[PDB]
Structures are given as structure tokens and as C-alpha cells.
Symmetry: none
Subunit: 200 residues, 2 copies
């Protein structure tokens, strides 16, 4: 499927769960904690900034500094990023990261044919910090792999893949040249790693 | 079929997706990333060079250093090769690999009867690109069979449909209505390739 639409208000759920890197996406999984891809976080360091749910230059939920980066020891393209709880620049709800974002909750599962949404900042260059939502069916779910046919671009690296009830079914990491997109499915092993690394 | 013809212009699409090893072929699948056969990459190492879309004389899309070799875990003769983004020798569109080449897109599928082309270097003499045409004989799981004439230099060749979309990668022939054998891109193999394209 190729159904990609601009998000008009990024300051409501589910959009408040998404964060922007310079040319990639991530999302909130718990207190002061974001998920993105290793291929994204390899270019960031402690003290670099992330912005919560920006809408171009129209408003955002704050600018936050990275305090810790932890990569999944396994093969899957998953990296945990913790931020300082107190914003560099406040969001509308004040300086606290957690007041300005909404973590996603895992779905019970996913299955071929169900419809998903990939939400993120697709454009590496143009449409800076413009959030889009891209829809399509799940093609397969096998182990730590989820495949879905939804249009994505390179800035979608680190995007949440949500089901129709805005529950988390995967994290996006790649797409085919010019029908399928590939996400990591949250197996118990990956979930255990993420849970151990959510800021206490 | 035995319909093999020299590629007139090697600097246009789809030929800009093809790269040359010493006496074998591979092709671009993504950022800084090429596919070839395991039986090709086993003779190469990190730090060896590949040439993007060379012509018969001296012109090419650059010379690039190998940075990673990742074989597919499975029976199929498929290897992922990443290159340094910055050319050892620049192409006409500069030092960036990705500015000088054009990745292939997967076909929706392939069926017996349709006509394909196998593009590569069947004669190891100067790199000279050829195109070899023929019908698809069968498709079964990760195996695509086609009657198109090939030589050993075609190892790692893209097999393309009439719209220049990727239907498999060449790995073998029989020793003209002889059959040749490619790996068809099953979901499992696509996933591995997507996991191992440079990002």
C-alpha cells in the first residue's frame, strides 16, 4: 500500500509518542526512554538532542538531551536511548519529558493481513520535522520479523508500527527499493532487554 | 535460447545497476550494497575492489572498496557485499557510490513463459557487458529456471523481467535450449538482504 498522509496536530495521542532525530525517528517506551534503530543511534552521542513530536517549526513537546545509549546485543536493529528528564527547551506541559509524551503499549500480537500504521519523519532532507502517517497490511510475522506493505522513506528509520488500536507491533528499520517494509517484532527476548533498560 | 548480445551503452539504466568483479558479476540492491554469489565472494576479501558499470574501453561508475561480506545462511548461493561509500577512484557523478549507480527494484513475481534477461560478463577477456535473453522455464520456492545462454562470468548476474525489475540472481548453468539456474527472491531471502543493506 501507498497511503501516506501529513499529520495535522502532533500534540495529541498517538503522535505524542513519537520523537525526531536529525534525519530519523524514534518513539517513547517508558520513563525518559526512547527506542530507535542502532543505525540511527550510531551517529549520536550523549549530550546530543532529540525533539518530542515536532510539527515543522510550529510547536513541539520539548527538546531533550541524550543521557545514555544502549544497543540490543542481538542482531536486530534496536537501540534504547535515555534522555535527561528535564528538557533543554520546555514543551507546553513544562520541562518534564514525561509530562510531554505518551509511551506506547505492546499489542498482544500481530498477524498477516491486519492493518498497521507507520508514523514518523520520512524525509531526510525536505519536510523537516513534518510528521507523516503511512498505512498498509501486515505481510508476515515470524520471530523478530514483521513485514508490512506501507510506503516509507529513509527518515522512517526508528518509526513505531502500530496496529489499528494504536498499540505497538514493531519498530521500522528498512524498506524495499521504490512493496515491502521491514520492522522488528517484539519477541520476549527483545522486550526483556528494553524493560531492563527503561530509566528507573 | 541462445540470444546473447553486447550491451551498446553500459552507462544507462538498467546497466547502471551492474558491477564487475575480476571474472564475475554482481548488482546493486541498496545503499553501498551489492549482491553476488557465495562462490564469487569466497575469492574476495574486505579491502578488495569492484568496478561499477565498466565499459569496454576505460570508462566506469567508479572503483569501490569492499567493506563487508555477508553470506546468506541457507543453501542458496547469495552473498551481500557492502562497499565504502567513497570511491577509491571517482565516477562521473563524483566519489559517492550511490550517486553513480542505480539499485534494482523487485518484480512482483515471475512465471513460466515470461522472457527475462541475464546481464553480466560471460567472457573474461577489458570488461564487456552482455545481455542474454530467454524464457522462464519454472519457478519453485527459491529456484528460478530459465533458458538463456550463460557462461561462468555470469555468476552473480541480475536476472530481470521485461520491465527491468529483478526476478532472481544467476548462479549456475548446465553444460541452445539448455537451462540456467537463479535464486528467486523468496520472502526469507528478501528479509536477509534488507537486514544487511548498509544503513
Amino acid at each position: 500500500e501507498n497511503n501516506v498522509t501529513k499529520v495535522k496536530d502532533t500534540n495529541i495521542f498517538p503522535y505524542t509518542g513519537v520523537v525526531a532525530f536529525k534525519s530519523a525517528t524514534g518513539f517513547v517506551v517508558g520513563k525518559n526512554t526512547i527506542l530507535t534503530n542502532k543505525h540511527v543511534s550510531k551517529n549520536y552521542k550523549v549530550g546530543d538532542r532529540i525533539t518530542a513530536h515536532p510539527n515543522s517549526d510550529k510547536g513541539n513537546g520539548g527538546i531533550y538531551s541524550i543521557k545514555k545509549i544502549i544497543n540490543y546485543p542481538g542482531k536486530e536493529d534496536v537501540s534504547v536511548i535515555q534522555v535527561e528528564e528535564r528538557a533543554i527547551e520546555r514543551g507546553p506541559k513544562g520541562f518534564n519529558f514525561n509530562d510531554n509524551v505518551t509511551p506506547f503499549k505492546y499489542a498482544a500480537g500481530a498477524k498477516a493481513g491486519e492493518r498497521i500504521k507507520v508514523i514518523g519523519y520520512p524525509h531526510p532532507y525536505k519536510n523537516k520535522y513534518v510528521l507523516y502517517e503511512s498505512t498498509g497490511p501486515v505481510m508476515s510475522v515470524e520471530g523478530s520479523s514483521i513485514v508490512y506493505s506501507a510506503h516509507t522513506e529513509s527518515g522512517n528509520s526508528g518509526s513505531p508500527v502500530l496496529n489499528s488500536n494504536n498499540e505497538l507491533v514493531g519498530i521500522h528499520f528498512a524498506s524495499d527499493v521504490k512493496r515491502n517494509a521491514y520492522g522488528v517484532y517484539f519477541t520476549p527476548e527483545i522486550k526483556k532487554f528494553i524493560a531492563e533498560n527503561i530509566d528507573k
